[PDB]
A paper describes a structure:
In parallel to the crystallographic studies, we also determined the structure of [name] by cryo-EM and single particle analysis (**[Fig fig4]; [Fig figs6]; [Table tbls2]**). Within the 2D classes there were clear examples of top views of both octameric and decameric ring structures. The octameric particles resembled the octameric ring we observed in the crystal structure, while the decameric particles were assembled in the same way as the octameric rings, but were composed of five identical homodimers rather than four. (**B)** and **(C)** Cryo-EM structures of [name] octamers and decamers. These different oligomeric species are present in the same purified sample, indicating a degree of structural plasticity in the stoichiometry of the ring-shaped assemblies. In both cases a star shaped structure is observed with C-terminal COMM domains forming a central platform and the HN domains lying peripherally on each side.
The ten eukaryotic [name] proteins are core components of the Commander complex, with central roles in endosomal membrane trafficking and signalling.
Author numbering:
A (entry chain D), B (entry chain C), C (entry chain A), D (entry chain B), E (entry chain E), F (entry chain F), ...: 1 to 220
The structure:
């Protein structure tokens, strides 16, 4: 490729020397049957739930899931086999080994075996990419609590005033980088967020109720 | 003053020519009895709930509440009567009228009558100032909803993929100015905010339970 | 209101003293029939195309369109008549006239006559608001042209090198304020933008082709 | 030099031990004949299209193209041979080898052989530098598509309103760093950009038509 | 002038119709004797401490102090009388009155009478300008106090941990505009600032001790 | 873990092979008795002040203090033993050694022995985290001194004007990064800061006087 | 227009009621003869140098120069007479007077009389606009001087070290707004700027020498 | 130290094993005689101009100059020998070798031999630090040239208008980082900068003329 491949992806390149045909075609069938929209760990669950497949195929299947995104980040208008040939040539140029017709044939044969089945996986990784493809996004947050006190011009007095200052901390991404953001509240606004969000939840319930022809994704 | 006084505050300066002693002292007593931490509209409610006071005093009482903050934003270490004299002189310098001993005496007499009672009101306006006295604060927010669609490289296909992209818009202040801030979500994170806020609410319940010697303010 | 009303909106308040019932109900009927999503000038066209209505109603109808947004920016969960009463009271407080039962009744009667018909107009102004309700938006742009020249270390030579440096200037809004933004190009990139935009246009053609149950807005 | 030379440039320093005179002078002749304004890959094409040159010269020729910019970024008012001597001394100071008269002579001889021919290449690299030498520049962009939906206060209704919100994403450089920039559109503005750009293209056609004495560069 | 003169400065232009020679020359003498570096209020004190001068001259003397800066912001290399003539012509162009030889002569005569004495005042206003002539400067600050509390994972426990978080707020100017700046502390750092500043104060004492030939300004 | 552990923390993992029970339980007892809120160096002092403990335990105790924060940064709602198991599994995945039941048992046994005692240490590290958990914080500052001079339009004169321009430099953190900030002063403002800070110090004295039930932390 | 016209431009609208034909055509001839690229004050000089024209025409001629830019900022592709008609209609809509055929005819007749001659003036105002049409531009600058002193750890020593720290202040515009920018120097760099600028000046001399067919503008 | 020492500074630590007393004391004498304010290359010149010193001492003398800054960046109030002991202990902690009394004694003996002579060098490095110790500073700049052309609405015309748009590019530092800054000019402003700078140069000449008791530094 024009990109450098560490063993996180080269592992498959090295391990592709034994895997056979029935197992790969059956896995393609299963993935076509697999509920589209699964995470890498979900694919690990699917693999571990196997009974017809050998344990050796697992060394790359989880990586194939990651390689799928690299395989499915590929441009659609570009020919699949031609792109495979180009990336194989570039990899051999900067790869760990010079490729003869034997390993080249095994690689490209398995590759076309894969892309022929990536409809579900193509859709899954398209879905995964898009949810982030905005200006900024979300990870997590907390809240804190204060009990600030009020000091008189007469320090000898008993201070007997109390407060509740909620705080909020959100975790959000821009340009593939993390940041912080802080803000101040009070009780009423808290209730108001809460009620508003609950009613939003009802709205999703209604939209879920409406469309039957579309199954809605729940990906993280 | 060094500050210019429009009729929002000069109205009292002009209207102070008739109000008598019993009404002002009784109002001071009531305010001392008034639950510390009331807003201007709450003071309007207290005034309208009156039965011993004349209607004429109302022309400034609501303004006295606003003048109280101007009266209670005053520096504590500075002598009350001396500060009154200085501000009266500066106002007469740039005010609507040159002050003789008559109006000056009425003004300063009523002033000392007021500051002698501003303990509750001093505390109230101190409280009001502080909650904002941070780097930034809060007014309001909304949410929206999208139903983005997914387009294939084969436009002739039925598009059958659906999404739910919540949006958030917060209203927050810096340097006495307003702004906006926008962000992206998904269902799980919504539930997570909701649960976290509910548990925060429980925390306030516990802290409320603990301290009996302090009555906690609920000011907006 | 809490907002001050100049004659851009007070004009209706002043002019509401003569308009009758048949004309207003017929205009409501027409607006219900009016293609939802029309601009103020489109409403002016609709008005000028009238034959059953008097010319006098025009003094506010165009303003009603603007007042509609102020009438339709109103919060939905708040009762229509109660909100009308509150805004009428606040306006009378700071308005040009104190309102008796006569003008108050005429105003509120016409108001409820209007809000009873604002479904199309509510939808229109919701639509108008939303397209802008993002982080930033668009007005206009240009391009320029340069013919920079290349100077040798030998100034006595004939300079015979030529260039074409397109420039771009976009007009965009943040926080209700305008700005500028500038950038550099070359021929290929120009062709590339052009082709990409044309293919986008085809995409809209396809989506337009798909959905028959939804009529898509073309508002500016 | 004062700059450190990795093998991307030191490779020539190491490989200069065999190349002969006829090949270098013929390559200088060819480059003088080479259409001024070629990229490194274009120079690679020119090299691979060779028939009189040995394959060994290629190890640095492509680097000479890159070294040319380092050789042609050099200040013009500074003497060529004196600058060569200074940079050779500094490199020997921090280089991979201490230079005797033999390698020093080979290096400086080849250097003066090169700079004697860099008129075309000097012009080319001047041209390459300048197009970027502004406040900010360009790489690429995309567009997206939305199909936002409109929700009533009556959720039980069929939502039948549709929209088309194009989006734009430009890739631009400041201070040798990349960024993003986002914006909102609608159909008309799209057509308007398109027509405006087409007419700009016509303008280049006219200017191309006018000047015959100047051949205009098309460099990327 | 090219600048517009309101009555803050036009007042002198209007009031210059009566003042005589002995008073102005004696005031020039006094100002030459006046301790260089006085503020406008200090000049007011000097004026009010007068016994030989008429009260009428005061209407502009305080403004002359302000006009002095406008008179001493003037460029030094430009001829004093020529600059006076130019500014008088421009003012008459956009002033409240067209100037004949009479008022023109009175104005310019008094002007040259003034600039002939502005050595002390020139130095004073130069001094005043410079202290601000940096990137940013100072007005004021405060501190606050917190008593944050520590909440356990076991809310039923008595919270018995205490803190002291000083805060700081500085007031500083850039581009003739004000801002804020906030920061966090603890006790040790407070002591450290305090000791460091005290030792700085000693340093000024030493430098004050050293130079006898220079009297150091204390201007605000 | 999901985080990589260098020998700053892996040292304990490697050294945990000999430490016994009485020493660890006695150290837990001591730490419970240790004044909550001690720094790593304070824990080193506590360790070196030992007489019942072996010297070998010291190899990790100081690291346990650092590991405590990593152990006490852990989420409270997550089960202690389950989190220990998860982190042990992940570490064994990317650790220096694959863990059998022997080292796993020793590790987890000691771990539960520790977390059973971390109340004081949990509170300490919570305290340590929080003081920084704001928008920005403090390290240090200096001051400088100038003796700027005043130059006349007559350079032949003796310059005899003197000044004192204090400067300030603060060291403050945002986003775990350092910066600078500079500002200008004069004598009065210096005195004013000094007096204000002294009076703040008195305020802490008063608050210290008030609450007896809470011991206030002095951590750096 | 869509823009509001104050008397800075409405003055011509009001004063156009007397001017005749010979004077306007002769002024058009003169302007065609006028050296293209003159400022408003240069046009004032040209007017005052008149002998065939009446003094009354001057009331707008200087404004015509300003109106020319408003007349020449007009879009070229739009028909001149049609644009005149549109702007006249809009002005009459929001102007000081409703226009009959008489004043409308006088206005439009004079307008077409003007635009028929604006070739020189069109070029002039195009030129004026462009020089600013970049990201930022220039007004002015200064320099200052320091004589900082060096303080020992032994304050009793004679300080005998001296420095020269030039400073620079530039005045530059972005988005039609002014700013500042500051920087630090030393003697050598000063000489270097000076020499570099002088050699640049020589470069302009050479380019001036080269092209005879083009007269270069010197506009401010 | 708390800082890590690479061989740029550890080289002296390793090479200090042979240097003798007479050479170091004579070099201290020479440096005391050396014109205070010399750069590292100036010290190299001084060293190479030696005749009494051995060549071996040169391996660190140039580094001593750099180590001097590290030796003279040291805090003045801290005891020299105590600081030496602390830094030696910390270095031995993280250094290349554990230090016995022999190398420790040689190191500390030479160290005290050095600091006893660093008055000139202390002053030099203080001077070096300060000139940069502002908000931002300077390296270099250029200028460019344009010959923009003016295009008519009638493209068939001969374009015969010419311009001269100087450009400026400055190189300046903030927070130890580099940047750019760009700006637009014209001929007059160029002359104006030039004249202003020349007159500034005269000002330095005058100040140089005035003070004889202070020798002014010229450091780069």
């Amino acid at each position: 490729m024009k990109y450098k491949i560490p063993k996180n992806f080269l592992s498959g390149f090295q391990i592709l020397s034994q895997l056979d045909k029935k197992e790969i075609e059956e896995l393609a069938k299963l993935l076509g049957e697999l509920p589209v929209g699964s995470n890498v760990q979900e694919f690990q669950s699917a693999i571990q739930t196997n009974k017809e497949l050998s344990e050796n195929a697992l060394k790359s299947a989880d990586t194939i899931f990651s390689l799928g995104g690299l395989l499915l980040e590929i441009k659609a208008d570009d020919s699949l086999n031609q792109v495979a040939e180009d990336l194989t040539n570039a990899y051999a140029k900067e790869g760990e080994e010079e490729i003869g017709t034997e390993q080249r044939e095994q690689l490209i044969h398995n590759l076309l075996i894969v892309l022929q089945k990536a409809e579900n996986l193509k859709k899954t990784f398209k879905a995964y990419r898009l949810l982030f493809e905005n200006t900024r996004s979300f990870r997590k947050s907390r809240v804190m609590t204060d009990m600030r006190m009020i000091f008189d011009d007469d320090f000898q007095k008993k201070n007997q005033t109390g407060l509740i200052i909620h705080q909020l901390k959100l975790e959000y991404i821009e340009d593939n980088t993390s940041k912080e953001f802080f803000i101040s509240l009070d009780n009423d606004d808290v209730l108001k967020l809460s009620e508003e969000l609950k009613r939003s939840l009802e709205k999703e319930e209604c939209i879920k109720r409406d469309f039957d022809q579309v199954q809605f994704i729940n990906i993280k």
